[PDB]
Design a protein around this nucleic acid. Structure first.
Length: 56
DNA sequence: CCGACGACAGATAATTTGTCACTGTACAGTAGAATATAGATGCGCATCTATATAGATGCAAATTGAGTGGCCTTATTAAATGACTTCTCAACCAGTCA
């Protein structure tokens, strides 16, 4: 048996979250995760735990 | 010391429900009805049939009247009755007598 889901055209908030996810797609260093997660919290204006929930 | 995940609490749009204002649309005589078909049922009229003959005919006893055929002692006499046949049926003159 088979299953899949595909996103339609993204909303503007989902576009911003796509740029944040792309900003968090590159790194390999724990220091750089901490830096880019905190800048992403500032870019989204959310808590650091909120950005962690978004990545998850 | 740094990073990731769970508990608890807090804030938030999606969902559902309710209320309110503006609006497209039906009310305007109208689809029960027309037109085929098959299939079964019933009344009428004809077309046979099977029974029922009484009249006519042929025949065979059953007398019935009307025929026809076959079988029989005889000769004399006498009487009686009834018949037949034959024959016959003159008239005056001549010789006695009381």
């Amino acid at each position: 048996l088979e299953k899949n889901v595909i996103a339609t055209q993204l909303s503007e908030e989902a576009q911003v979250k796509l740029e944040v996810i792309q900003s968090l797609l590159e790194p390999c260093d724990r220091t750089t995760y901490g830096q880019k997660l905190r800048e992403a919290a500032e870019k989204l204006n959310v808590s650091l735990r909120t950005v962690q929930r978004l990545v998850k």
